[PDB]
Design a protein around this ligand. Sequence first.
Ligand SMILES: [Mg+2]
Ligand SMILES: [Mg+2]
Lengths: 801, 801
Amino acid sequence: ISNYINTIPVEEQPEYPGNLELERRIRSAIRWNAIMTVLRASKKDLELGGHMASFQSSATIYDVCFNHFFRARNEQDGGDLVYFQGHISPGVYARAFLEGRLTQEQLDNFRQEVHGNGLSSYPHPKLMPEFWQFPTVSMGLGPIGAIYQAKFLKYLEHRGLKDTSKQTVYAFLGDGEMDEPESKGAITIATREKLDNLVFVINCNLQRLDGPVTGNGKIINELEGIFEGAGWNVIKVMWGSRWDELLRKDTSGKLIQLMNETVDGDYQTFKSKDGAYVREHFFGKYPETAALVADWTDEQIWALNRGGHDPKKIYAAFKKAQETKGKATVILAHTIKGYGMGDAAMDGVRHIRDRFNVPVSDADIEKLPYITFPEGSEEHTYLHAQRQKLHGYLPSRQPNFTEKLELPSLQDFGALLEEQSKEISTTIAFVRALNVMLKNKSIKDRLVPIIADEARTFGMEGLFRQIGIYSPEDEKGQILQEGINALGAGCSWLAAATSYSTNNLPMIPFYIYYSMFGFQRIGDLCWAAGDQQARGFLIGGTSGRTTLNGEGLQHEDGHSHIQSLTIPNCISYDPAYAYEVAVIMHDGLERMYGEKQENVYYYITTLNENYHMPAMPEGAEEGIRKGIYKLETIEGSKGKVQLLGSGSILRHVREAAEILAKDYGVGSDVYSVTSFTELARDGQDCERWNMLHPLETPRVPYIAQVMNDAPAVASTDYMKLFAEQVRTYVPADDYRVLGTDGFGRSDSRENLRHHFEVDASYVVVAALGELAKRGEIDKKVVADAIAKFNIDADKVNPRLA
Amino acid sequence: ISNYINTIPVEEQPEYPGNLELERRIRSAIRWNAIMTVLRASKKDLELGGHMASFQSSATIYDVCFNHFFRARNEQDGGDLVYFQGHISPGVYARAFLEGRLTQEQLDNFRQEVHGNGLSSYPHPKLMPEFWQFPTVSMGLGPIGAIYQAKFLKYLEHRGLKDTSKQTVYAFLGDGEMDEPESKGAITIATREKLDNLVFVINCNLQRLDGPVTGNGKIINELEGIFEGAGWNVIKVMWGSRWDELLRKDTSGKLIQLMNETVDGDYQTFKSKDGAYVREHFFGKYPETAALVADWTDEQIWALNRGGHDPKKIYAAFKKAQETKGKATVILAHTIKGYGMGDAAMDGVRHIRDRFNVPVSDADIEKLPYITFPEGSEEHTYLHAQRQKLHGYLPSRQPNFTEKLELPSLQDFGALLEEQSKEISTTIAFVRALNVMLKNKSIKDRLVPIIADEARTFGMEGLFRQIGIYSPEDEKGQILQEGINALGAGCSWLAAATSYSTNNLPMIPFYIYYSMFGFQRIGDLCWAAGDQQARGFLIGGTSGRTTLNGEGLQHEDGHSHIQSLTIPNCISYDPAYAYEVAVIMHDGLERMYGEKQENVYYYITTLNENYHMPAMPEGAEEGIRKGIYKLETIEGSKGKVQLLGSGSILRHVREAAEILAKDYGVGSDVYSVTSFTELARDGQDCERWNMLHPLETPRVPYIAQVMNDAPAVASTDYMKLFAEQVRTYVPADDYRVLGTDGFGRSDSRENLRHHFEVDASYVVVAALGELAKRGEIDKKVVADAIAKFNIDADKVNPRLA
Ligand SMILES: [Mg+2]
Ligand SMILES: [Mg+2]
């Protein structure tokens, strides 16, 4: 922690390259338009919202960047990757409007997007696919996301995939936002990986939303202390140019001392008062400091500004950041929240019009007019020339990659479709599917296997010797090993999964980790990944409540599919067999990276239990992709039921199928359900369509087409709702669902499958129960199956155990 | 960073107080029993799992703490709160066995707990309610949980509720675990809050599971850098006692330079080699370092050890932490993973029994016997005497608090049960319910309102003036303001919600924040909270997809209830009216903190939308608690339907009820569904019981005791599955569900409710469609309805928008 003054002393400050007065004229129009946009929205009284104070305190920081640093997407690379602070969006839209990229009608539809021609509240690529790039409003995700994006750019260069050397990643943060654990939690990574293509810009207005960050301390000092401690290059932009004569004059070092001893709350107090209150409470703390302004008019005291509002001080910090090599740089920019808004942060509008010398007449002010710069005007010429010199405009986004990939065919996954000699797991199947892909010429180097420490647990160890581990085990290593860091791996996955848009270079990430630590731990990143149109694979290993038996409560996943189904563009599967994994993976590949270029990402849960893997039945492909297909039909003269299973539990549903046939004469149709979620969504779409087209013939849900009306029983390694979600679309009067509701615990797979009530004997008892409620068999036979299977009818509900 | 040697020189090291020789003997028995427990489980070949290498590396650190530092729960306070590293639990179980607290049968049932007399793999209070206290195996959570627990103890003391000055919070962490962003993401708070009652003990063995944490770097230096930068007191325990003479005679300073420049990878390489190797590749790097050991045998060089295995250096560190005030302390304990296990890292166990001089006959090593110390023996006496001096044994847990609280009655919330004057929201209702609680003499000071910065956004600003904000706005402040830190607020909430157990001081926390950032963002903590038996309230404000209209994609919550339902002991509600909010909060208060002491926590979604709040229907109380009650029946002779709604959408369903009756002569039964989830669970419990008792009187789901068989339509502000989950138990053959599936976006409430197809118009069309399919009205009526309401039958499905 250094003195509370600029890191870059004036003697080392480069000459500012732009026309200050002209840039200020342009900036004032941007400030004006951003405010008009939000005010016009308010006028509608539709509780739309929108911020103004924030952008006002940081506009000059962004302005210097737009005039002198931000490289736009170009023929060589995707340009600088800017994670704009979400709340300043009205400012971004204002500039875009000025550069003629957005129309007045769009600004007038700020926060009204349903009818089509509006603008999102915040950066949401999903909502504005050709404009926004990085979802940042969920505080904390932007900084860690940016760190891993920068690391990913380095990876692409080291792999020889693309020269990203001219690209800088900028993460614009708030000082209040830094309290989010994800904000500073991963900063040492930028040091380990020498990310000199990453710049953190923290707007230190000493305020958050409902107050200051730390009123009793000095948030800027805390930030410097930990970033410096983390090995980062720290640049403090504390004071404007007016303090420079004062400082090279305070021979006593008393001013420095005064600046160092004053705390955040007070500096904020000074903000509100005036020159008088300042010359007396601040400069009047000592005679050596009271003497520096003792002969300064008050109004001149009040003109002393913070560095974050001074273009010259800002330019030097970014220029310095740009030159630094070997480590990341963090710029702590000192600003005034609600700067120049007086009163608050038509009299109010009048005040800002005057404050920024905005070209709006008294006659026009009540219309809340937007300002434009005609072709030919000095402002219009300069605005565009600065951007042209920096390759164009940003933000902007390309929704589809341009090259055509030559994807492996399903037949290339041929060995996985036939009966397996050895007993293997769906996880071993996954790894083998990866190997097929690694032999494909077109995509083999585009694949990004991602792991979080654990490789051996998922049988990934063999890949290590074939493609290596990225480690700038060398800079050509292909596998990304992120250590014990679920969020970080997820961020690497997101960067790779969105490379197709960002750098027009499709990369196909496969992130495998404990399914329990997927959506449950990084769910907010998964939702943002959907917003960012991520196209990749999330592989939930060691999944299923009863299957990762020995681990217990915090590891046994009986609900990740309940969490994954809440993401509109995430496609989820829970396969039982190796051939299903093959078919599913081929399809996602095709959908996401084939000509269709569908904006979805896949979630497949895999298992750590080995068992016999049979051959795929001929013609089952489409059923597998759709979510359900009939495996077999077993004869039986005394009854008929339908049995559904998925994942590790399918094997047990089939055992029940034989027990029913063998001991009770009950026949059945056995179906493998590769995705209850995809079937429920299909069912919902059909009922929605039927409701909206009452004069048409009702469409039939696919599951209803595959199944019949005989009483049905379903069992899975997940909570009941996973299978219950398709109830409305199941064409049978009786649909019983078995599931693993309840906290997991340690034991043998057999004991857990009995405790959660999902094993063969419970499937049998459930099936017989339905046939008895129908009369096909007497209740006494279900009561004896119960005694026979040593089933404890009165043990507590597993959900409560 | 400092030099790569012990922070505490020998000359400042206190004399060790215990019987080393004796302690060693006891420690060796614990190591043996720990390994025996895991090996015996392996022998069963049930894939049980379990670790050994980790406890072996950190056993001595824990041993010094069990013999000289850890205070157990006592009459005055809960004792020291130790967050044991999860995978070293076999060693804790071994120590408990030796203390006579666990039986041999229990150890023999390690990881086999379903039948009652076994042990959980890791610390899980839920599974072993009288033993474990803090669930730590989901890495990263323990560190941040510990920080907020330490801060909460301070709170309790500052608030004058309990003197916790004698308690220390210890968080035992792995070095690999520090990569989780949650691990260091909040360490700055420890300095802000001066948590000198907190100690982080980082086991620096230099490796994660799959290799070194940073082979090419020095994690201990990285760790020291960021913690030092964050203001913590850092104590490194680098080298054992045999290095003291070596360091003392090296006047050249070369040994220190050598230690400083050597990276983690090389240090790990030395541990796998031998003395000769070390002489040449380490000491042999320099003439002066070579000379320091020239006079040593290879075997004597081989005996050089890491500090974390030397009790004297360990003690030195912990004692020093105890005397440090004004900030938290972190001890970086340098160890060897797989310590004393040899190469391995039946009989190959005979190697560790020679290594630690275990008294087991090489002839009986085959039976893998446990070692115990008979009463009367030196070992037994010393073991218990050290613990008695420190108040007993740990870990242990008390499942219920002892005092009786005088809870407010429902009548006390009487004002909230009447018709409200002004239109308010359920969030304003929540705040008024809180106010009633703050008037109760018994619990007024036990309440812990927790906010994450956002106060004005939830109408909490009025409580400030009243009970103040905690800030040691002073140290008597009751409200916890945690800033923009959802995980941190969650940790504070967790500490308070479990105070009834750890301190026998029940505290009742109410953590309100944006519902979107609840389970989605801190879901792993919520799962852990369930495991820790938290009793409190999570209030999801600004909830509902369409209700927080302007905010858009990353704020519009239409699914937190899907996430919350996956947690077994979390009770979820989505009330529409203020009186429902009061009845629910009263019930929860009584269930969790009244005589019942139910181990459950509550999740209530509240709204930011004002509307008319009618009086509670007489006798509706229980129905509100159960999840559904009939609001009213509207007459009509052309047809009859059932209409269900919750949250902000219920008033639109009632609007539809009016329309159906007046425009189409269709009458209806209208139901307020306060909890679809509780209804589904009750339904699941009923069919489960019925399936297991086929000859007995079937049980009837609560929802079927309220609804009839007329066709039904349900609409909510959450995805369809929220209402669809009760399909199986709904006693009507037609149950249509409208919901907000799909990504949110910015617009007016009206436009969003129309886009997500859940407004009054769609409920009407859905109801008519059901009647038309029954031939009760003409299909053309439904078609004319769609036209009249300006419904676009062909707009894309909102899930895909
Ligand atoms: Mg800020
Ligand atoms: Mg380690």
